[PDB]
Write a protein that binds this ligand. Structure first.
Ligand SMILES: [Mn+2]
Ligand SMILES: [Mn+2]
Ligand SMILES: [Mn+2]
Length: 244
């Protein structure tokens, strides 16, 4: 019954699945791990991911149909991962790019090196539209690294935070390629700065979901209540347009 609010499951629109078959296999693995609702958040990024909205929506509806071949109770909701450039304010205000399941929440991302002042300003402007930012993979941002302050100041302003399931996991004994991101994620969890864990799944090679492993790890380290909050209860509130 996990609810995954960050995913690249739509074929032929971004760096996610290339085909219907690949979308189906990604959905199947997500379901196998215990996920029961997935929010599609394919990339909207000026200068990198600019597939027309009409094509994303059309391919999304096909993916929702494919999900029925996986399981009758797998819920597929619409959404977007919005890389912040100033044109997105008008797109959001005019409802031309999607929020998460038509709620007040929008999934927002920045670059690794985006300065804190720019993150703060962008999020403030989005809040002024009546939209609540969910900050995508906060472990990515140099500006927030080891910085409980900064993260809390963003939260206190009205934002919520999301960390990728892959970075929740322990560093592996061999072949660890993402040690620093794991370490950042570990700090955010330890300081209780994380509202949601989501997969950011793209495929079944380099970027599969790690939702079941992350759920078990959080359960072990922080208890079942925190695990339920991060993987089920907070993401459900977002999907249902309820405040956290
Ligand atoms: Mn991507
Ligand atoms: Mn991203
Ligand atoms: Mn993503």
């Amino acid at each position: 019954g996990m609810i995954d609010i960050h995913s690249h499951i739509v074929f032929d629109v971004d760096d996610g699945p290339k085909s219907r078959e690949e979308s189906k296999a990604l959905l199947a693995e997500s379901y196998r791990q215990g996920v029961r609702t997935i929010v599609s958040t394919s990339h909207r990024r000026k200068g990198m991911f600019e597939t027309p909205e009409e094509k994303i929506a059309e391919n999304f509806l096909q993916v929702r149909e494919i999900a029925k071949e996986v399981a009758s109770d797998l819920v597929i909701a619409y959404g977007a991962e919005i890389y912040y450039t100033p044109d997105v304010l008008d797109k959001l205000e005019k409802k031309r790019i999607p929020t998460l399941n038509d709620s007040r929440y929008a999934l927002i991302e920045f670059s690794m090196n985006t300065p804190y002042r720019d993150i703060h300003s962008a999020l403030s402007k989005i809040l002024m539209l009546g939209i609540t930012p969910v900050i995508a993979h906060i472990e990515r941002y140099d500006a927030l690294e080891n910085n409980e302050k900064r993260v809390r100041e963003l939260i206190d302003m009205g934002c919520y935070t999301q960390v990728n399931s892959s970075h929740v996991l322990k560093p592996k004994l061999f072949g660890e390629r993402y040690k620093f991101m794991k370490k950042r994620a570990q700090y955010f969890l330890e300081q209780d700065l994380v509202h949601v864990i989501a997969s950011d799944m793209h495929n079944l090679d380099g970027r599969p979901p790690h939702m079941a492993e992350a759920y078990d790890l959080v359960t072990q380290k922080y208890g079942e209540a925190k695990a339920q909050e991060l993987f089920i209860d907070n993401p459900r509130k977002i999907v249902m347009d309820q405040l956290i």
